Amino acid sequence: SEEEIREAFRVFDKDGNGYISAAELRHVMTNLREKLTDEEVDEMIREADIDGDGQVNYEEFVQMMTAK
């Protein structure tokens, strides 16, 4: 199950730069593991917003996505 969520990010990070935007993070999150509602995804995405550089590293998010 960890492999699935890593490749899911590469669908958007085609360049393989290791970064996606917060708008792409929700795109992945709504496409897989539907255990959360959109409202629940949107309230937590406020902690997972973009940095001042405008990027979010999804590799650390892989670890959080496979959490229990």
Curated annotation (Swiss-Prot):
Top-level taxon of origin: Eukaryota
Binding, Ca(2+) 3: 13, 15, 17, 19, 24
Modification sites for Phosphothreonine: 30
Effect of residue 61 to L: In LQT14; reduction in calcium affinity; not changed protein abundance; not changed structure; significantly decreased thermal stability in presence of calcium; no effect on RYR2 interaction; significantly reduced ryanodine-sensitive calcium-release channel activity; impaired negative regulation of high voltage-gated calcium channel activity; impaired regulation of cardiac muscle cell action potential and
Residue numbers of N6-acetyllysine PTMs: 14
Span list, region Necessary and sufficient for interaction with PCP4: 1-68
Coiled-coil annotated residue ranges, if any: none
Other remarks on this protein: This protein has four functional calcium-binding sites.
Entry remark concerning the domains of this protein: The N-terminal and C-terminal lobes of CALM bind to the C-terminus of KCNQ1 in a clamp-like conformation. Binding of CALM C-terminus to KCNQ1 is calcium-independent but is essential for assembly of the structure. Binding of CALM N-terminus to KCNQ1 is calcium-dependent and regulates electrophysiological activity of the channel. The C-lobe interacts with KCNN4 channels in a calcium-independent manner, whereas the N-lobe interacts with the S4-S5 linker of KCNN4 in a calcium-dependent manner playing a role as calcium sensor and gating the channel.
Family: Belongs to the calmodulin family.
UniProt disease link: Ventricular tachycardia, catecholaminergic polymorphic, 4: An arrhythmogenic disorder characterized by stress-induced, bidirectional ventricular tachycardia that may degenerate into cardiac arrest and cause sudden death. Patients present with recurrent syncope, seizures, or sudden death after physical activity or emotional stress. CPVT4 inheritance is autosomal dominant.
Full protein name: Calmodulin-1
Native source species: Homo sapiens
